[PDB]
Amino acid sequence: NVEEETKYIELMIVNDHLMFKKHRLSVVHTNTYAKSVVNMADLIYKDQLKTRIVLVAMETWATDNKFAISENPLITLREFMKYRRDFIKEKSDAVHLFSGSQFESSRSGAAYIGGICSLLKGGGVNEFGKTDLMAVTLAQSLAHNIGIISDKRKLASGECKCEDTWSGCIMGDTGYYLPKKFTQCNIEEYHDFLNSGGGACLFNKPSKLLDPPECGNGFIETGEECDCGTPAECVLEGAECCKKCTLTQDSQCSDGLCCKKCKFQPMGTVCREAVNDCDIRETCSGNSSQCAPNIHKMDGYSCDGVQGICFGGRCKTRDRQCKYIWGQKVTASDKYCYEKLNIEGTEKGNCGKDKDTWIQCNKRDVLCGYLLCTNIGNIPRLGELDGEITSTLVVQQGRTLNCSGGHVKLEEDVDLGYVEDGTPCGPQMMCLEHRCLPVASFNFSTCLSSKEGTICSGNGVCSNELKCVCNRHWIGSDCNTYFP
């Protein structure tokens, strides 16, 4: 089970110049301070989310800031992710910024929701505070990255409530008394993100860490043949295999998912099953104690049958988008509703917005326009609703159909309530810029196949790495060799 498995977040911390000045321009004070913050946040995540926060690398700016810092944390987040895209070449699951400046905003930090392990969205921004306060701030920013949201709809309902009255939970407003515990609903949101195909990287276990290697920490490090962790953890698994981070001569497998009875699991054993249509089952290499890197189907595979297309291990459909924004009780509207409402180009439906003008949806591209959902509550699950919800009813073939939408804004630049890019408006057609476009237009890369008209010769599936994962009894580069 993905929930049962331990997840590891490789984190890189970037300290701006103001953070450096707060520590009196001392590299050791800044590094030790950040390490302390990440360690406390790791304690919270380890206790609650069964997730470990590992500091892989840290970059500190002794000179002035590379990019201009801003009072708005969202603006500073855009600039920071821009810089980290073009400049930072280090491998990490998430890149977070520690800013000595204090953001003027209700937020003490900003992080892209569900952005974990995105080069563009994988980062977060955190304002300066005390070590405990910074640990909570990092906890809620990384929470946004792993898909933990406020979920305002259930909060207003009261079904989701932090049961600690004195101190809140992490996602809530932080007073002088600091929260140590996540809500159960936050846990469910994190597990739903994992189950939808998010954060596949998190299942990779860190090979190298910034801190000097210590034996018994549970992570193998260069020069360490094996690590079984704490003596009690060792007794659970890997006690006989590994002692003092030295492999026993009999047994090169100590503790791992692909590790059993201190010997490598045979090749082809399945460590973790696929979590959805877009995921691909990982298998034991037989040459490693850890399970193979978590991979998923390449973009463009069909998910939920016809209704959707796989992107980043996650299935994109209008129904899942409706259920995401307006809650699980919602479903996507019938296609006639899109067809009649969107062509009108009024407030009720449109292909887009211009200043003082509304864009009539073109006849050809409809399902790529304004997002319509059958049953819509008053309060969105995430973001803030702009204006009031739009409701229009249309009847096809003697049965009335209610189709509604709303404008929901996570941030000012990006507006929800419009069909997300990549949704399959039509066969061999993906929604892009409120338009139905043939899949061929953007030319998705495919895996090698010997046979024509098939993927991976028809014996395999394309992966995130653009390599064929062959079916049983078939092997090869193109999966074209028969080897039962």
Ligand X SMILES: *[C@@H]1O[C@H](CO)[C@@H](O)[C@H](O)[C@H]1NC(C)=O
Q: Please say which residue, 195 or 375, places its beta carbon nearer to ligand X.
A: 375
Residue 426 CB, shortest distance to ligand X, in Å, is: 18
Q: Does 166 bind other proteins (CB under 8 A)?
A: yes
Burial 217-245 (b: 16+ CB within 10 A, else e): bebbbeebebbbbeeeebeebbbebbeeb
**Would you count residue 20 as binding other proteins (CB under 8 A)?**
no
Instruction: Please choose which of other proteins, Ca ion, ligand X, none residue 376 contacts, taking the beta carbon within 5 to 8 angstroms, the exact cut-off set by kind.
Output: ligand X
Does 42 sit near Ca ion (CB under 5 A)? Answer: no
Whose CA is closest to 97, among 128, 120, 51, 143? 128
CB of 219 to Ca ion, least distance (A): 5
CB of 128 to other proteins, least distance (A): 7
* In the complex, minimum distance from the CB of residue 96 to ligand X, in angstroms, rounded to a whole number: 33
For the CA atoms of 105, 107, 109, 114, the dihedral, rounded to the nearest 10 degrees, stands at -130
| Site of interaction with ligand X (CB under 6 A) | 287, 375-376, 389, 391, 402, 404, 443
Residue 104 interacting with other proteins (CB under 8 A): yes
Task: Please select the residue that binds other proteins; options are 89, 163, 176, 250, rule is CB under 8 A.
Answer: 176
CB 98 within 8 A of CB 128: yes
Closer residue to ligand X in complex, CB, 247/274: 247
Select the binding partner of residue 221 from ligand X, other proteins, Ca ion, none (C-beta < 5 to 8 A, by kind): Ca ion
Residues 114-143 that bind other proteins (CB under 8 A): 128-130, 133
List binders of Ca ion among 290-309 (CB under 5 A). 294
Between residues 175 and 266, which has the closer beta carbon with respect to other proteins? 175
- CA-only gyration radius of the chain, Å: 25
Dig out the tokens for 340 from the structure.
């009649």
Told to check if 158 binds other proteins by CB under 8 A, we report no
Is residue 400 a contact partner of residue 377, using CB atoms and an 8 Å limit?
A: no
Residue 204 binds: one of Ca ion, other proteins, ligand X, none (C-beta under 5 to 8 A by kind): Ca ion
Our CA angle for 20, 25, 29, nearest 5°, is 80
In the complex, what is the shortest distance from the CB of residue 54 to ligand X, in angstroms, rounded to a whole number? 22
Residue 201 as a binder of Ca ion (CB under 5 A): the answer is yes
**Measuring CA to CA, how many Å separate 182 from each of 125, 170, 325?**
20, 6, 22
Q: Output the CA angle 176-182-183, nearest 5 degrees.
A: 110
In the bound state with other proteins, the residue whose beta carbon lies nearer, of 92 and 108, is: 108
What is the binding site for Ca ion (CB under 5 A)?
10, 93, 201, 204, 217, 221, 224, 227, 279, 282, 294
What is the binding site for other proteins (CB under 8 A)?
102-108, 128-130, 133, 165-167, 173-177
